[model samples]
Target: STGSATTTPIDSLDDAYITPVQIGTPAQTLNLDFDTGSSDLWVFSSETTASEVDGQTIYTPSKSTTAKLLSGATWSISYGDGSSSSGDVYTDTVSVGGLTVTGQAVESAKKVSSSFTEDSTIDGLLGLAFSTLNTVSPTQQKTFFDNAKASLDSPVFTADLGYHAPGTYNFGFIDTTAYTGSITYTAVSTKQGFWEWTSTGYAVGSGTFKSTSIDGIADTGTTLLYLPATVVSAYWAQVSGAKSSSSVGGYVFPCSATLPSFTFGVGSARIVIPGDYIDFGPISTGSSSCFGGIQSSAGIGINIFGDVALKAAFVVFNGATTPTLGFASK
Candidate 1:
């Protein structure tokens, strides 16, 4: 009826968060990225080619009695970065934390891109977004969260992402101690298959809050926060020597520059992101230029409130018949 899982950052930069999941009869555990941007539970498996396999863990369905092939079903997904993976489908017993789900559709990866092969920290990805975004062909399948929703006490899940630390993902109930202050709820539009919502507005540093409607998706899979070019420029303007560079591929500034914090509104509530979080890391191994965590979303087309912003607060994805999103200070 309920579950709780610990998610840790894969690298010092907090590039991704991975949580261990149990699959099949004997419970083969694999570290999977709990992605809220996409909807497909996929993993590296015994069917994967040796060339595509590196140091990551693999799920072996052949060794599990509970694993049953979903005949004629297959899936393939591509990321914004062009990385892709595809494979056949299998229905098996899957568990997260202590919550178990029978006949959970698990896509076994037979082929993967070079970026996936090179990243050894994650074995696969467990999508928590809406089932409508599932990539399975012939017959689409429900995500792990979707199948577990009915059994969840309140049909809700919470994400407490950390900045360079371990956080938690809880299903069924909200952990009161995980956050501070009262929660601010907002309407979610799932028509786009994302946790899409309109933010009240934003402010740079200690400036006044601007009253405007900014629409974006709360994506846990992405590493950085992306907003409109006008908003991004406003934030960077406060930091001296900051500029958008083609060579750096984004907004970068002197590592020694004092960065200003960013604040965004959710109804009447305000969530402030610490300045240190915006100063992502050095552009190179030993460079004096630092990349920014908040960038312009002009090229991406859609604004994304990724881990960079999520880490500053506790987020709730309410999956009731009328879906909504909740945010609170931590």
Candidate 2:
């Protein structure tokens, strides 16, 4: 059987996009963050203490006859922002964009860090990264993509992210019509458990596109683009009154300033991030200062081509041999 599923971005507080997914026998639906940065299909569940949960809809496995426990297995994950979660495992049917995976590992959270508890709308995370990165102890879990890929018409998915608008994540095949111009392909390295790739170089504003290599991953879950400190500093310098404010953290600039575009190179292809996208929004009430969407990935080590960068182009996550990424203007 061959089919494709499309997901739309959930409107939230300039937060990560959520995709509706079906889990269990009768299919309990949850709005999950389709994350390529991690590998775990964990949900806020019945196992969580009621007092700990806020407005999030919890997943109750007991309600589904098809759910089965993975005895003695556990999962714990901590994000770069210090948000964390830990839970036990269950096996159930999982479906996304019409693609279904039988007996998929679904981690049910018993405890979640403040970051998770505070974000009440997100029910869970559907990890699209390599299955090897799964956190299940005693036995690791397989992501929905891994289990569903073998039966797909083509082992590929396209991410078409947008700004304050509808976007789609198409599964099983690439819709060439979704993008403009030729899709430039680049080889990816999964050695670090990420869909990571190296850019030939980049440019700030109207400056020349240099040849300095920057290695990073294409992360859908992250809202901002993170680059090396040197790169981030250089970008902010181009904008008047831009500075790294420890009080607010990261770089902030006057919202009225006209910013320049940032460009990243992929061999011969150059992906340009417009200035309008760089200004995330005003920082606070009555404040003309705005937080930049591009920041330094100093401590994290690897740069992250988060949502801000991804939205500028149509990206193909090719699961075929060699795992190359294809990028084109949307």
Candidate 3:
């Protein structure tokens, strides 16, 4: 194992922000998909009760040089989307790339038998969605972001997502390479200091969405961008005859068309979801819509700017000093 220390100094998290935490001693950095769409930080651990997570990288903080437990701190997070999981709290000194901070907090699940377990090969999740969205309230006790925010280096964080295998996923810092020219900034609506937002609209191909609005608490735990029904329906309406299915629950259009640009409005900043993302569907048959851009569903909180929206903009998540979400791209 490694030495134990306080949480790292985290400045902020990227939009569509799933925090990649180094779990075990040798610092097994697991790429955990976090989301505000749902609230929970569930990763596979050697301690899991289910064997379904076999072969996956299980994190054991005790194996890390910076692992620390919160004594009696326990956690159980449930989501509005009907998903739930429970675990215990522990402190770990974590570092992402070059951005290192100590004393960061995390939830290591002890009992998990849900969609999260059967779904993917992903190691786990770090749900930095929101406090209200969390099942581990003060009453429940312990939150991923709540405990981990302090260890951040800056009040700001960013997400640089890779489009596909050719694409890449970068976090902890904003990449100014994609800036059209000068990127503007906006103040986030929350204080818990995680990635949260309220999007104005969405668009695909050549047309934009109709009054598509959302409460922006950018989630990272998700693979595809999930949207609300009104937003998705309106977005699909622009598709001429885009069909809808329950598979991924979004509209699908032939990638052969002149797909419009998908843009999301966040108070003042505008994040444009790219073409690669617009036609993100790459499944087999029942779904031929190459793009998994939008997943339609009911509303939760306001509008969340998951990875879909965050990838386009340079964001800054400030949990220290002043709890707020900031965006930039110059």
Candidate 4:
């Protein structure tokens, strides 16, 4: 069945987008981060120690008759940002919008890192990445999209992730009215369990985009756009006051300085990141310094088109034959 749901900015933590999901028989609802960077639907749950769960809602699998323990099955995951979660596994019906996947493996977290526990608004993570990357130990699990794709009219999903405003994620359907301009399609490499694609070029500010193909993943869970070190250095160099600040933890610049636009290639078309979008936010409270939304992918190896980059465009994750990606201005 086709379905769609709106995305919410998780409080001041707009870095991650949240969507409501229903699990179990009586429908235990939770606002989960829709992450394209990781696999496995791990939720803060009743199994978690009371001291471990901060203010986030915990999923109680035992409250639903449909929940069945996947005996001995467990999962553990660590993010690049150091956020981690681990838990026992259970099979239950999970629904998003109007689409439901029966007996989907649900990881009930008994432990979580401070990064996750501190995010009181997000109860869990609904991973949209490839099933091959699912984190259930000993036995991998299929994502909701994978299990539901066969019954879908088309094996595709669209992510319209907006800045401060609400955006909708449509499953098994595309709404042309949600985007502006013609959608440009590009081939993706799923060998890395990501929507990895090559760009035709990159540009600073505006015109005369240079040809410099780069491979990267379109990750919705990541906060900043991570590009090669040279690319990041080149762009930041244009801003007179910009510098890599150890105190600020990234490239920072004077808040009053005028910021230039940034553009990255996507097949034949170029996706532009407005000046305001790259400024991220202030470096600290009541400060005249701002941290950039673009950073070096130095230690990470691969570049990442994170929330800062993805929110600037309407993305279509087409899982048909070759797993292509379609982009259009939103």
Candidate 5:
């Protein structure tokens, strides 16, 4: 079986992408963030404390006749940003677009961090990473994609993230028309539980390409693109007033400064991010200083090709026996 769904950016900055998911017997639809960096299909639910709930949709497993509790099973997860959530587990019918899965592990959140509570754009997260990263105790649970892969026409899913526009997420099949030219395939290292791959190199605007091997994860859950300090510094140097500001938390520059486009290599193919994408936004409302979308990943330990980079191309998460990643210009 194959399925397709529309993913909408939560805000103008594309902070996160949300897709509608159907859960339970009668089908309670909730908008969830399709996170490729982690593994845990968790949701804000009836089990959550009312005091912690804000303007978000809540899943009520108790109301679903088909929902069954996975007795003694529990889960907890924390992100690099410090946001966390924990809850009990339940097996229920979950559907996305036209695809459906029975006995899918649906983590019901009993508690969530302040960041998640304040961000009502997403009811929860649907992890698409390898199941080895799943945080469940006692017995681990497979991701929705993992459980559904066998019955799918193909063990693959594609992400077509957009900038200031809605994108598409397709499962079980690749839409040839969704991309241009040909897809550049690369080997993926799943030992880290992420869709990690090596980038050939990068270029600043029309500058010469640097032949360096940069390893990183294509994380849809993250908001910015983080690379090595040298690479980040090279890009920022092209901007007239760019400065690494500790007070500002990252690289910042005058709003009037002209920004240059960034190019990265995927095998022999090159994907370019428009200059406007790198000029994230003003450091604050009406501020003349703007924060950059690309920053140094030194502190992060690993580089991250987040939404800033993902939005520039069509990405395929191939779940073959030996997983591979595919990138194509759109």
Candidate 6:
């Protein structure tokens, strides 16, 4: 979901990022994004200064058909970047995807400082990520999943990430039936964040890279994987007619080479990541660098196993009910 709104009911912002919900009689409405990485429902508030919240939907406690102040519990969030946001704690009935319910515990932002704030379309954020990744919890608070886990069917969660097109991002009661095509399900390791891992191990061309099998985790929140340099160099060697260039950086490579098919064996299933995904995308519109997704993350410790890998599979984070990672194909 796109989160370009700084404040609510702002202009020129597309509705694609905002999920609309009708909460009460005569309807107290709100717009929120469907984020799968974190688990906190938040919104811009009427109390927030116009300078602080630009295009966000301001939910006035007085105007809301239903509202509950969380007793001025001061709250704030700081990202990997230095930027941060602060506000109060409040609870309300939020309607999302035609599902309406009250006491949907959440936070309210009165102060935000980041490029996200400058964007009029990106008001506050609705953290669809894991509660473990959340900073709001003092005693390990239960997140959105914790709240509605008991009611969901099959105890399933689905993230219709629209990286390629219009995406579907939801947490509770995800229609698991939505994934009923030729797909194989993969199990998850017990990790804290949506950052879960599988040991299927990566291979380049016909053999494993560096004569060593590598591990990968599927993370939608991260943009790309931070593969090891040793593995990258060894694997790049097998690419069909693959060539390296000194122009952009030695770190990036090029190949019209008939890229080899690579697969990772996850438990009972052997999942394959197309070579095109490796040697695909554009280095330039005319030239096929074909290596847009894989790159260097030298200092960054683990491979993010980002959406690039995720696009190849249907994924789920089972935090509330079972606390595991689940992936499949549709």
Count steric clashes of candidate 6: 26
Q: Give the candidates in order of TM-score, highest first.
A: 5, 1, 4, 2, 3, 6
List ranges where model 1 is wrong by over 4 Å: none
Candidate 1 per-residue lDDT, tens place, 1-330, comes to 999999999999998999999999899999999999999999999999999999999999999999999999999999876899999999999999899999999999999999999999899999988999999999999999899999999899999998889999998999999999999999999998999999999999889999999999999999999999999999999989999999879999999988888998899899999998887789989999999999999998899999999989999999999999999999
For candidate 2, lDDT tens digit of each residue in 8-126? 55653345787888899798998888899999999999998777799998889999989999999999998877788998999998888777888999999999988788887799899
Q: Can you tell me which runs of candidate 5 are displaced by over 4 Å? A: none
| Root-mean-square deviation per candidate | 0.8, 1.5, 6.2, 1.2, 0.7, 6.2
Q: Give per-residue CA lDDT, model 4, range 1-330, as digits (tens).
A: 698999898756467788999999899999999888888898999999788888888789889999999998999999889789898999999999999999999999999988787888899999988999998979899988898899888999989988777889999998989889999999899998988988787898965798898899988889889999899998999999899977767899988988898898887798998878787668778889888988999988889999888989999999897899998987
Q: Candidate 6: misplaced stretches above 4 Å?
A: 1-33, 52-54, 81-83, 119-121, 137-141, 170-195, 204-217, 232-265, 272-291, 319-321
- Candidate 4 residues lying further than 4 Å off, grouped into runs, are none
Could you tally the backbone clashes for each prediction? 0, 1, 70, 0, 0, 26
True lDDT of residue 105, candidate 6: 59
Question: Judged by lDDT relative to the true structure, which candidate is superior, 1 or 3?
Answer: 1
Q: lDDT tens digits, residues 146-238, model 5?
A: 999999999999999989899999999999999999999999999899999999999999999998999999999999999999999999999
Quote each prediction's TM-score.
Answer: 0.99, 0.96, 0.71, 0.97, 0.99, 0.70
Model 1's TM-score against the true structure? 0.99
- Candidate 2, residue 239: Cα displacement in angstroms equals 0.9
Candidate 6 CA-lDDT value: 0.55
Count of clashes in candidate 5: 0
Measured on C-alpha atoms, candidate 2 has an lDDT of 0.87
Candidate 4, pairs of clashing residues: none
Tell me, by lDDT, which candidate is best.
5
lDDT of candidate model 5 versus the reference: 0.95
- Taking all chains together, the TM-score of candidate 6 against the true structure is 0.70
Q: In angstroms, give how far residue 141 of model 5 lies from its true place.
A: 0.6
